[PDB]
Amino acid sequence: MLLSNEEFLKKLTDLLQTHVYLSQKCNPVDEASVLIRAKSGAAEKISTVVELDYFTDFFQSYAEVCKGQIV
């Protein structure tokens, strides 16, 4: 189900921990903000809605989980 940003990043970690790939879809939502979907290999999909005002912050945290899992 639709997760909060902080939970999406938490579950993203644990998707990459249990893994290579990451695929992501983004569609815009009408209240203006964006729906992000992520899926890694065998795992289910995960979802969150990121508000325009929180884009910088969210993508800054998103980078963290990404580069954190690589090392």
Short mmCIF file of N, CA and C in Angstrom, two decimals:
data_model
loop_
_atom_site.label_atom_id
_atom_site.label_comp_id
_atom_site.label_asym_id
_atom_site.label_seq_id
_atom_site.Cartn_x
_atom_site.Cartn_y
_atom_site.Cartn_z
N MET A 1 0.86 -1.21 0.00
CA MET A 1 0.00 0.00 0.00
C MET A 1 0.87 1.24 0.00
N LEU A 2 0.27 2.40 -0.23
CA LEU A 2 1.04 3.63 -0.33
C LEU A 2 1.77 3.93 0.97
N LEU A 3 3.07 4.10 0.89
CA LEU A 3 3.88 4.33 2.07
C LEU A 3 4.23 5.81 2.21
N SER A 4 4.48 6.23 3.44
CA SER A 4 5.08 7.54 3.68
C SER A 4 6.49 7.52 3.12
N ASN A 5 7.01 8.71 2.82
CA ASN A 5 8.37 8.88 2.35
C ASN A 5 9.40 8.19 3.25
N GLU A 6 9.30 8.40 4.56
CA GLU A 6 10.27 7.84 5.49
C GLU A 6 10.21 6.31 5.52
N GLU A 7 9.02 5.74 5.37
CA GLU A 7 8.89 4.28 5.26
C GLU A 7 9.36 3.72 3.90
N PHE A 8 9.12 4.47 2.82
CA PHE A 8 9.55 4.06 1.47
C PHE A 8 11.06 3.93 1.41
N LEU A 9 11.76 4.91 1.98
CA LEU A 9 13.21 4.89 2.05
C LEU A 9 13.71 3.77 2.95
N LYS A 10 12.93 3.45 3.98
CA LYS A 10 13.29 2.38 4.91
C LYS A 10 13.18 1.03 4.22
N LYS A 11 12.13 0.87 3.42
CA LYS A 11 11.85 -0.41 2.76
C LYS A 11 12.72 -0.59 1.51
N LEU A 12 13.12 0.54 0.92
CA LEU A 12 14.04 0.58 -0.22
C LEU A 12 15.39 0.02 0.16
N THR A 13 15.90 0.45 1.31
CA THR A 13 17.10 -0.11 1.91
C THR A 13 16.98 -1.62 1.93
N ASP A 14 15.95 -2.11 2.61
CA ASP A 14 15.80 -3.53 2.86
C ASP A 14 15.53 -4.34 1.59
N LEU A 15 15.10 -3.66 0.53
CA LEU A 15 14.98 -4.28 -0.80
C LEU A 15 16.33 -4.45 -1.47
N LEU A 16 17.19 -3.45 -1.29
CA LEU A 16 18.54 -3.47 -1.85
C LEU A 16 19.50 -4.33 -1.02
N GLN A 17 19.24 -4.41 0.29
CA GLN A 17 20.00 -5.27 1.21
C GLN A 17 19.80 -6.74 0.89
N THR A 18 18.56 -7.08 0.54
CA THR A 18 18.18 -8.46 0.25
C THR A 18 18.54 -8.87 -1.19
N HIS A 19 18.94 -7.90 -2.01
CA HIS A 19 19.44 -8.18 -3.37
C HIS A 19 20.91 -8.62 -3.33
N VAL A 20 21.91 -5.74 -7.40
CA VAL A 20 21.88 -5.29 -8.78
C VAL A 20 20.75 -4.24 -8.99
N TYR A 21 19.74 -4.59 -9.81
CA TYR A 21 18.77 -3.64 -10.39
C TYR A 21 17.96 -2.75 -9.43
N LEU A 22 17.42 -1.67 -10.00
CA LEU A 22 16.36 -0.90 -9.39
C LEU A 22 15.59 -0.25 -10.52
N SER A 23 14.29 -0.47 -10.55
CA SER A 23 13.45 0.19 -11.54
C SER A 23 12.41 1.05 -10.85
N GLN A 24 12.07 2.14 -11.51
CA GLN A 24 11.30 3.19 -10.90
C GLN A 24 10.38 3.84 -11.91
N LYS A 25 9.13 4.08 -11.52
CA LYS A 25 8.21 4.83 -12.35
C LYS A 25 7.72 6.04 -11.59
N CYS A 26 7.48 7.11 -12.33
CA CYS A 26 6.97 8.33 -11.76
C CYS A 26 5.87 8.90 -12.57
N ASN A 27 4.72 9.04 -11.95
CA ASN A 27 3.60 9.73 -12.57
C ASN A 27 3.21 10.91 -11.69
N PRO A 28 2.68 12.00 -12.29
CA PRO A 28 2.29 13.10 -11.41
C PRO A 28 0.87 12.92 -10.83
N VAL A 29 0.66 13.49 -9.65
CA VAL A 29 -0.62 13.45 -8.96
C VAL A 29 -1.21 14.87 -8.86
N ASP A 30 -2.55 14.95 -8.82
CA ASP A 30 -3.30 16.23 -8.89
C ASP A 30 -3.51 17.01 -7.57
N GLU A 31 -2.65 16.76 -6.57
CA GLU A 31 -2.71 17.47 -5.29
C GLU A 31 -1.33 17.70 -4.67
N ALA A 32 0.15 20.04 -6.82
CA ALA A 32 0.84 19.12 -7.72
C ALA A 32 1.99 18.39 -7.01
N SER A 33 2.02 17.06 -7.15
CA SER A 33 3.06 16.22 -6.57
C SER A 33 3.23 14.95 -7.39
N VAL A 34 4.12 14.06 -6.96
CA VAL A 34 4.51 12.92 -7.79
C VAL A 34 4.44 11.58 -7.08
N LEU A 35 3.89 10.59 -7.79
CA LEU A 35 3.84 9.24 -7.29
C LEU A 35 5.05 8.49 -7.79
N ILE A 36 5.86 8.02 -6.85
CA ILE A 36 7.05 7.22 -7.15
C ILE A 36 6.82 5.74 -6.83
N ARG A 37 7.11 4.88 -7.81
CA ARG A 37 7.08 3.43 -7.62
C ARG A 37 8.49 2.87 -7.78
N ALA A 38 8.93 2.03 -6.85
CA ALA A 38 10.21 1.31 -7.00
C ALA A 38 10.02 -0.21 -6.91
N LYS A 39 10.82 -0.94 -7.67
CA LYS A 39 10.80 -2.39 -7.62
C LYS A 39 12.23 -2.88 -7.80
N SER A 40 12.63 -3.84 -6.98
CA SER A 40 13.94 -4.44 -7.11
C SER A 40 13.78 -5.94 -7.25
N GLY A 41 14.28 -6.47 -8.36
CA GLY A 41 14.28 -7.90 -8.63
C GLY A 41 13.04 -8.62 -8.11
N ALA A 42 13.27 -9.70 -7.36
CA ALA A 42 12.21 -10.60 -6.90
C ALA A 42 11.17 -9.93 -5.99
N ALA A 43 11.59 -8.87 -5.30
CA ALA A 43 10.71 -8.15 -4.38
C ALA A 43 9.46 -7.57 -5.05
N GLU A 44 8.44 -7.38 -4.23
CA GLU A 44 7.28 -6.60 -4.61
C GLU A 44 7.69 -5.14 -4.88
N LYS A 45 6.75 -4.40 -5.47
CA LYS A 45 6.84 -2.97 -5.67
C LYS A 45 6.62 -2.21 -4.34
N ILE A 46 7.16 -0.99 -4.24
CA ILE A 46 6.87 -0.06 -3.13
C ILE A 46 6.54 1.35 -3.66
N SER A 47 5.71 2.09 -2.94
CA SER A 47 5.15 3.35 -3.46
C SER A 47 5.15 4.44 -2.43
N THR A 48 5.32 5.67 -2.90
CA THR A 48 5.14 6.84 -2.06
C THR A 48 4.79 8.07 -2.90
N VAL A 49 4.09 9.02 -2.30
CA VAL A 49 3.80 10.27 -2.99
C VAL A 49 4.67 11.38 -2.41
N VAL A 50 5.51 11.94 -3.28
CA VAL A 50 6.41 13.01 -2.89
C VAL A 50 5.88 14.37 -3.33
N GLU A 51 5.66 15.24 -2.35
CA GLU A 51 5.16 16.59 -2.61
C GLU A 51 6.27 17.48 -3.14
N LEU A 52 5.95 18.34 -4.11
CA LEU A 52 6.95 19.24 -4.72
C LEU A 52 7.85 19.95 -3.71
N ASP A 53 7.25 20.43 -2.63
CA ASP A 53 7.98 21.12 -1.57
C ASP A 53 9.06 20.26 -0.91
N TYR A 54 8.91 18.94 -0.99
CA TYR A 54 9.81 18.04 -0.30
C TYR A 54 10.77 17.33 -1.27
N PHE A 55 10.75 17.73 -2.53
CA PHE A 55 11.59 17.11 -3.57
C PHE A 55 13.10 17.10 -3.24
N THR A 56 13.68 18.28 -3.02
CA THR A 56 15.09 18.40 -2.63
C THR A 56 15.45 17.40 -1.52
N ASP A 57 14.71 17.49 -0.40
CA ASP A 57 14.90 16.66 0.79
C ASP A 57 14.83 15.18 0.48
N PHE A 58 13.76 14.79 -0.22
CA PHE A 58 13.51 13.40 -0.55
C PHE A 58 14.56 12.83 -1.46
N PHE A 59 14.90 13.56 -2.51
CA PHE A 59 15.94 13.09 -3.42
C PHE A 59 17.32 13.13 -2.78
N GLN A 60 17.51 14.02 -1.81
CA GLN A 60 18.73 14.02 -1.02
C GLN A 60 18.83 12.74 -0.16
N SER A 61 17.72 12.33 0.45
CA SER A 61 17.66 11.08 1.24
C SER A 61 17.72 9.85 0.36
N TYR A 62 17.12 9.97 -0.83
CA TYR A 62 17.08 8.91 -1.82
C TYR A 62 18.48 8.56 -2.32
N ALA A 63 19.26 9.60 -2.63
CA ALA A 63 20.68 9.44 -2.91
C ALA A 63 21.38 8.65 -1.79
N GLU A 64 21.14 9.03 -0.52
CA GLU A 64 21.77 8.39 0.66
C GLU A 64 21.60 6.87 0.68
N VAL A 65 20.36 6.39 0.58
CA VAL A 65 20.08 4.96 0.56
C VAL A 65 20.74 4.26 -0.64
N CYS A 66 20.74 4.95 -1.78
CA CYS A 66 21.35 4.45 -3.01
C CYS A 66 22.83 4.24 -2.87
N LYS A 67 23.55 5.32 -2.52
CA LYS A 67 24.99 5.27 -2.33
C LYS A 67 25.43 4.54 -1.05
N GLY A 68 24.52 4.43 -0.08
CA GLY A 68 24.79 3.69 1.15
C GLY A 68 24.87 2.20 0.89
N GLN A 69 23.99 1.73 0.01
CA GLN A 69 23.89 0.30 -0.31
C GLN A 69 24.99 -0.18 -1.26
N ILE A 70 25.56 0.75 -2.03
CA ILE A 70 26.61 0.42 -3.00
C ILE A 70 27.97 0.05 -2.35
N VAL A 71 28.36 0.78 -1.31
CA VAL A 71 29.61 0.48 -0.62
C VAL A 71 29.45 -0.74 0.29
#
